[PDB]
């Protein structure tokens, strides 16, 4: 109904510096630097002090206000990404055919290889996005760990691994074979 004013608060810890100009957000922390372009929302940022940043929408409708809270979450994820990081844990689920997963190098592209999924002869490869590191945890059976500063890069990279192992022409209720995200958390 064209609300006069809507505000959201963004906190920053001691070790994180945030520079915003012309809707360009650069977050620098102990773990690195993240950047984001937000020239599609029409909001205004202001600085209250060294530990608080406000974002506001003036004379906005229901749909415009709904995107204001999205900005706060996106900026907050950048802040905690450069401080705590993100960790996604995935498990291998199979009934008969073991799933073999290894990191391979192909023309300097840092791929990950999936072999013998449901006995398939086809070789499955998923590119590893920049800034994402992949480790195979010990003392845990069939677990792969993805880490990075960007939550979107880590989450989407893990999503690619789930989609590449979809069963076709079978009852997926019975054939529950694949790799699935089992835990979302932080590096620290």
């Amino acid at each position: 109904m064209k609300y006069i004013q809507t505000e959201q608060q963004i906190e920053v810890p001691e070790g994180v510096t945030v520079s915003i100009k012309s809707r360009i957000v650069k977050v620098v922390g102990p773990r690195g630097t993240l950047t984001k372009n937000l020239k599609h929302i029409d909001v205004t940022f202001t600085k209250v002090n060294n530990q608080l940043i406000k974002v506001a929408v003036h004379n906005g409708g229901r749909k415009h206000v709904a995107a204001l809270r999205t900005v706060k979450s996106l900026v907050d994820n950048m802040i905690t990404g450069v401080t705590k990081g993100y960790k996604y844990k995935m498990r291998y689920v199979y009934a008969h055919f073991p799933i073999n997963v290894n990191i391979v190098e192909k023309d300097g592209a840092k791929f990950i290889e999936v072999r013998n999924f449901l006995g398939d002869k086809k070789i499955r490869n998923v590119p590893v996005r920049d800034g994402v590191t992949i480790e195979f945890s010990t003392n845990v059976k069939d677990e792969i760990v993805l880490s990075g500063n960007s939550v979107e890069d880590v989450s989407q990279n893990a999503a690619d691994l789930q989609q590449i192992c979809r069963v076709r022409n079978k009852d997926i209720r019975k054939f529950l074979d694949g790799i699935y995200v089992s835990h979302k958390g932080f590096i620290t």
Binding site: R91, V93, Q162, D171, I172, R173, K174, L176, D177, G178, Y180, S182
Partner: protein, 50 residues
């Protein structure tokens, strides 16, 4: 593997189905996301295996 079977069932079995366009939906959804059926609220749970 009861622990791993539950994890896989969360993505393959714990879903809702639209009664008009058969779209696969979150279990707690109230309306279908598809524009083809006009975001209808007529939904049913996904049938369990046997």
């Amino acid at each position: 593997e009861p622990s791993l079977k539950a994890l896989a069932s969360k993505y393959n079995c714990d879903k809702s189905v639209c009664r008009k366009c058969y779209a696969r939906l979150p279990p707690r959804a109230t309306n279908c996301r598809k524009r083809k059926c006009g975001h209808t609220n007529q939904l049913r749970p996904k049938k369990k295996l046997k």
